[PDB]
Amino acid sequence: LPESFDAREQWPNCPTIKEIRDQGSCGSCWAFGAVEAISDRICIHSNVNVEVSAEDMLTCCGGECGDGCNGGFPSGAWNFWTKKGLVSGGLYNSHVGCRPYSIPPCEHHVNGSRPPCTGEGDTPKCSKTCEPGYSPSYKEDKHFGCSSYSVANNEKEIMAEIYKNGPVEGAFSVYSDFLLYKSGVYQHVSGEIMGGHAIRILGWGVENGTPYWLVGNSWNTDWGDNGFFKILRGQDHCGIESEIVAGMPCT
Ligand SMILES: *[C@]1(C(=O)N[C@H](C(=O)N[C@H](C(=O)O)[C@@H](C)CC)[C@@H](C)CC)O[C@@H]1C(=O)OCC
């Protein structure tokens, strides 16, 4: 395996890999990390490009994935993809796809032109219909996964999985010092625990001798490093290597 790897550069024909979304005022990171990686993999293993709907995952999976905007289970999200499939759907107010995201973007721990995010956000309804004007039908727009699995808490195995099959979804414990991340390789040193947070891991590298994972957060582009961040790799830091999940699209 190479010393560094960036899925964005390795798969130039898959622009979703470079995208950063905004989960809004809703604890749906479990859903976002999943649909983002799934969007990437559908493109990687079908070279079609599809903006997988975070809305469909968030609202229709149900208990199998947890509790909507109250948090969820990543592995459950990939299961939904293989069992019920996912329709397309872009960003809030984009009118792209069957079910675009319905929760407005906001400012996540940073100042900006958008309204500040609020902790309170209710899970939207599971509506099995597409926006007006979009074709085909909700049912016909479903994209299915043909496998859902968990990658071991093993650095090399995780790197090999990304290297071969594309970005994966992971999760780690967020402490307050992470909220102000701007650059460099994040290492937890202080702050009250905020809770678990699911994200998309799309690569790795070494910065100033410190090994790291290249990660895409779902707090828009004005947070962190253009929406991305790097976190210590190889020490299961904050549990970053303890909950890796992925899957393969049906062919
Ligand atoms: C993952 C999650 O969504 N994380 C939360 C989060 O992202 N919070 C947002 C923030 O700006 O910090 C706000 C705007 C949304 C309400 C919290 C916990 C992290 C700081 O509860 C989700 C989950 O399913 O986690 C289990 C992996």
For residue 24, which atom of ligand 1 is closest to its CA?
Answer: 14
Q: Name the E strands within the chain.
A: 5-6, 145-151, 168-175, 185-186, 193-207, 210-216, 228-232, 244-249
- The range of the structural domain enclosing residue 75 comes to 1-251
Going by C-beta distance under 8 Å and a sequence separation of 6 or more, which residues neighbour residue 108? 22, 117, 219, 220, 223
Q: Residue 209 contacts by C-beta under 8 Å, 6 or more apart in sequence?
A: none
Helix and strand counts by DSSP (H, E) for the chain: 5, 8
Q: Is 104 in the pocket of ligand 1 (CB under 6 A)?
A: no
Q: Rounded to an integer, what distance in angstroms lies between the CA atom of residue 251 and that of residue 231?
A: 34
Q: Whose CA is nearest to atom 6 of ligand 1?
A: 27
Rounded distance, CA 71 to CA 58, Å? 10
Three-state secondary-structure class, residue 219: strand
Task: For residues 219 and 236, give the distance between their C-alpha atoms in angstroms, rounded to a whole number.
Answer: 23
Residues 6 or more apart in contact with residue 18 via CB below 8 angstroms: 8
210-216/228-232 β-pairing: antiparallel
Task: List residues bridging with 22 in a β-sheet.
Answer: 219
Nearest to 187 by CA among 213, 162, 219, 155: 213
Could you tell me the CA-to-CA distances from 73 to 26, 34, 70, 154, 221 in Å, in that order?
Answer: 15, 10, 11, 20, 25
Expressed in angstroms and rounded, the spacing between residue 118 Cα and the centre of ligand 1 is: 11
198: left (phi over 0), alpha (psi -120 to 50) or beta: beta
With beta carbons less than 8 A apart as the criterion, state whether 59 and 68 touch.
Answer: yes
Probe residue for ligand 1, chosen from 36, 78, 197 as the CB with the greatest number of ligand atoms within 8 Å: 197
Between the alpha carbon of residue 51 and those of residues 119, 216, 229, the distances in Å are 26, 16, 22
Distance from the Cα of residue 222 to its chain's centroid: 17
What's the total number of domains in the chain? 1
Q: Crossing angle for the helix pair 74-83 and 29-44, nearest 10 degrees?
A: 50
Residue 219 identity (one-letter amino acid): W
CA distance 35 to 22: 12
Neighbours of 202 (CB within 10 A): 25
Q: Of ligand 1's atoms, which has the minimum distance to the CA of residue 23? A: 15
For 126, 130, 138, 177, 196, the CA distances from 44, given in Å and listed in that order, are 28, 25, 24, 35, 28
Tokens 């900006």: give the residue.
112
- What is the Cα 197 distance to its own chain's centre? 10
CA distance linking residue 237 with residue 87, whole number of Å: 34
Active site residue 29: yes
What is the distance between the alpha carbons of residues 242 and 45, in angstroms, rounded to a whole number? 25
Residue 45: active-site member: no
Distance of alpha carbon 19 from alpha carbon 17, whole angstroms: 6
Question: 237-240: long-range contacts at Cβ-Cβ below 8 A with a sequence spacing of 24 or more?
Answer: 237/172, 237/187, 237/188, 238/172, 238/173, 238/174, 238/175, 238/188, 239/171, 239/172, 239/173, 240/170, 240/172, 240/201, 240/213
Q: Is 85 helix (H, G, I), strand (E, B) or coil?
A: coil
Given a contact cutoff of 8 angstroms between Cβ atoms, the answer to whether 158 and 241 are in contact is: yes
Report the amino acid identity of residue 107.
E
Indicate if ligand 1 lies below 6 Å from the C-beta of 29.
Answer: yes
Which of ligand 1's atoms lies nearest the C-alpha of 118?
Answer: 14
Which of 101, 90, 76, 10 lies closest to 247 in space, CA to CA? 76
Alpha-carbon dihedral sign for residues 193, 177, 188, 2: positive
- Quick one: 218 exposed, middle or buried, by C-beta within 10 A (0-12, 13-18, 19+)? buried
User: What is the distance between the alpha carbons of residues 23 and 218, in angstroms, rounded to a whole number?
Assistant: 6
Instruction: Choose, from 14, 26, 29, 130, the residue flagged as catalytic.
Output: 29
Residue 130 is among the residues annotated as catalytic for this protein: no
Whether 196 and 71 have beta carbons less than 8 Å apart is answered as: yes
Residue 145, domain CATH: 3.90.70.10
Pocket test for ligand 1, best of 29, 69, 150, 180 (most atoms within 8 A of CB): 29
- Cβ(245) to ligand 1 under 6 A? no
